[PDB]
Structures are given as C-alpha cells and as structure tokens.
Amino acid sequence: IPIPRPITTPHNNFIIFNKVHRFLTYGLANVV
Amino acid sequence: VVSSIDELGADENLFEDYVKEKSVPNHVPRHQFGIPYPLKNYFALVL
C-alpha cells in the first residue's frame, strides 16, 4: 500500500555584481 | 557708483525688466531654472 515515485520540474537561481566608478560633471553654462 | 540714474518717476516699467523670471528666450527664465541674479536698485541718502 505505499507510494513510490518522485520527480520534479524547475531549478531557479540568483547572483549579483558590484562596481564602483568615478565620474564628473562640470558647472556647465546654464544657457540657451 | 559714479553715475546714478533716477530710478523714480519711471511705475510699471521701473520694476519691469525684473519681470523676466517672455518673447526673448535668451534670458533663461531666471526662476524655474533656479538662476542667480544681481539687483539693479541700490539705496542711498541725499541732501
């Protein structure tokens, strides 16, 4: 009277990346 | 100061250039764009 058969569908996952840049703007003329 | 013009008896034109904060887009709307500004009217005493 026991049950036997086991199986399954998916397999998900995660991951990340780290970065550090140095940028610069400049007091651009507030013009037309 | 070496010439002072009589900013007086001038009364909707006096403080009328200031009004630009129009047609000429080449006066970046003073406000809105948050731009600095100089004042053009200074006080003084006379005799």
Side-chain angles (χ1 to χ4, degrees), chain A, chain B residues 1-15 17-21 23-47:
Chain A
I1 40 287
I3 308 318
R5 180 256 68 180
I7 314 83
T8 205
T9 49
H11 298 90
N12 215 183
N13 228 172
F14 274 41
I15 173 58
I16 72 310
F17 301 115
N18 44 327
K19 306 294 169 294
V20 306
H21 329 302
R22 304 169 187 49
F23 304 134
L24 36 173
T25 72
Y26 301 90
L28 177 63
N30 181 1
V31 69
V32 212
Chain B
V1 49
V2 302
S3 339
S4 70
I5 301 179
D6 267 320
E7 305 193 272
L8 50 86
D11 289 345
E12 290 177 350
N13 286 337
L14 177 63
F15 294 97
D17 286 345
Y18 274 139
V19 191
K20 229 19 272 177
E21 322 175 16
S23 67
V24 206
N26 315 289
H27 184 86
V28 189
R30 244 46 194 181
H31 194 44
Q32 294 247 298
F33 270 105
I35 209 65
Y37 197 62
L39 303 198
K40 342 295 194 64
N41 336 300
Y42 285 52
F43 187 65
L45 279 170
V46 72
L47 150 57

